[PDB]
């Protein structure tokens, strides 16, 4: 069971400032919601030895903390204590509608970033909704109104290969071997290739970049909280994006 690896105290010590009044999602992201969702994905945080299980949870919280961070340079306990501050994309984001015969934009609905992986666009709400049996295309708001659903979108993303990308799960559990294409692209097993899966097109293969460092900062802090070593190839600075 995933609760044998990550306790409420480990969850809350990682996501220490998420419930400060400054964080608009305060009180949304409960440990119970996370556990309810995580138990629906066999293998999530239950694959390999205890170090592997801890590493997968460390990597998962590392990446999702970046997508939802309310951190800053001079934030209490460091910027890597401010994961999961948000549940909805900041700014005045638009509808994230890209017309699809397969997953149409429900009139009046918006598919901007929601929940721990900031799932975006009607294609992804549709694909995920179909996978987790939730009406996310018609009611994309569920991802910010219901914490179990919110966590389910993020773990769905984590567990699901797409196109030329392995699952984050396969990489995090050491069950991913680079193809010839990946080797030519300098995509090496490690946390950097997880970044590349999530947002490489923007963040990877351009040298030192703030967003990539921030994802690493969270993962290093959580590896320490779990009492494991991060391992190598933490960055995607020299990796060609997948897309």
Residue numbers in the entry: 79 to 321
From the paper:
Enzymatic activity assays revealed that the enzyme showed a specific activity of 235.3 ± 10.2 U·mg−1.
Structural analysis of diffraction data revealed that only the catalytic domain could be resolved in both crystal forms.
